[PDB]
Design brief:
2 copies of one chain form a homodimer. Chain A is an alpha+beta fold. Chain A has 3 helices and 11 strands. Chain A has helices at about 10-25, 170-210, 215, and strands at about 30, 35, 45-50, 55-65, 70-75, 80-85, 90-105, 105-120, 125-135, 140-150, 155-160. A 5-stranded antiparallel β-sheet of chain A has the order 3-4-7-8-11.
Amino acid sequence: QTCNASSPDFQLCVRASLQQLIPELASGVPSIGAEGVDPLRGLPPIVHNSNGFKVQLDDVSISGLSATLINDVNVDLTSNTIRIQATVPGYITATGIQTTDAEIMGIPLKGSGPFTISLANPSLAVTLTGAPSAGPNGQTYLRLTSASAAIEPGTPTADIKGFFPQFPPLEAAASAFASVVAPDVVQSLKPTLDKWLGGVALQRAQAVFSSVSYDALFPGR
Amino acid sequence: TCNASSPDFQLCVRASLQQLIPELASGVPSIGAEGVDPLRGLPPIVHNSNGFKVQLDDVSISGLSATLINDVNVDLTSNTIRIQATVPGYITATGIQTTDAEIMGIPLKGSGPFTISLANPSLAVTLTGAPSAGPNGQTYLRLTSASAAIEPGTPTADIKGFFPQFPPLEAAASAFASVVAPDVVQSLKPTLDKWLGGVALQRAQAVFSSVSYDALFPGR
Ligand SMILES: CC1=C(/C=C/C(C)=C/C=C/C(C)=C/C=C/C=C(C)/C=C/C=C(C)/C=C/C2=C(C)CCCC2(C)C)C(C)(C)CCC1
Ligand SMILES: CC1=C(/C=C/C(C)=C/C=C/C(C)=C/C=C/C=C(C)/C=C/C=C(C)/C=C/C2=C(C)CCCC2(C)C)C(C)(C)CCC1
């Protein structure tokens, strides 16, 4: 349902439209240049480098995102700024390869191996900004320039391998330790994850906004 | 008291010492001999080489009253006592470890109690001195040196103090210590040898202070 910008409840119309689109976005809508969101794969590395906290997350795949409920949308066609507040009921799960070198609460965690983290009841606030741009057809496309993301990660449950590989019970106990510290670790990873999600949100929306014209999405302006 | 001129004397000393081991356990203060089971009041064991830094304090060893003496030799010409002994079953040592090491890829930094059990260990001891005319004309052997050659047998370990800040990781570091303990003990063996040597020197000197060479071994 295209939302007429002149219509009295355009903001509400976009909310409803986007909600409808989430289940279809799961495997992806390749006609609109939108990659799959459940699973959300083919992502950049997550990189955090702080003193006593070096983490790289590679081959990141997130499942569970087609259950997303949209709290709010605002499309401000004066500034070309889309704000979305969304929540996932239940869980999302991320998989990939961790490479960590960290001192966490007195304990050394150096090594590399697979990860699984479940996040229970996460939310996100996203802001996207751009400017309209006349393409060589004369057709006007929105060229997005920035995204910021505010992840509320919720409750983490974690199974992390690769620590003390040289003795299996020590590996098993390091997996256990990782689960206990997971709330705190995720909480301190939040600004890294924020900037990362921002970048992904920028790139994946730009793919949509390249393919579908601003006048086709939002008639009457 | 074994006679030096008696047909067999070397076997008499072996047998003498064998009889004495159970009595030595809590200690024989008439011959100036501290207890051997437990063997306590000992110096620190110290090792610092090759990124492997270990201090063992408050060391106490149990199980030593089951010691079998394989051989004794008392060489009155050089004043040299060589003993070969074995403990059937187990001796166990307890104390405080403070360690800072990388062992087989794993960091072990911390401090806590230790227990280490050795199954069927053995020892070769050599004690050397010279005769000394003591107060009122009895001859006492004044020992000057000792070496010890420990054969540690099969080590098993329960060691606390590593990753204290999460209990399962401490429990797994205790497990890891048991698996590496043969190797660790084998590389500690020169440190342990010099330490035991010192103890054996000090503890025998106390005995050889009190009981004269002529009383122990008549007719020489
Ligand atoms: C669908 C969609 C949407 C939405 C979305 C969302 C809502 C998202 C989210 C997202 C999220 C919410 C995310 C998150 C993530 C995270 C992660 C992935 C992380 C990771 C982590 C880890 C892995 C960790 C680890 C560790 C530990 C725990 C311990 C220590 C060690 C270590 C470091 C290893 C929207 C509206 C836009 C529209 C369109 C479509
Ligand atoms: C009775 C007697 C005798 C003998 C004796 C003997 C036979 C002895 C023995 C002894 C011995 C044979 C000893 C041993 C000892 C040892 C030790 C004391 C050890 C220790 C160890 C440890 C404690 C360790 C630890 C650890 C580990 C294991 C791992 C890593 C970490 C650590 C390093 C912590 C005679 C005849 C001379 C006479 C007099 C009396």
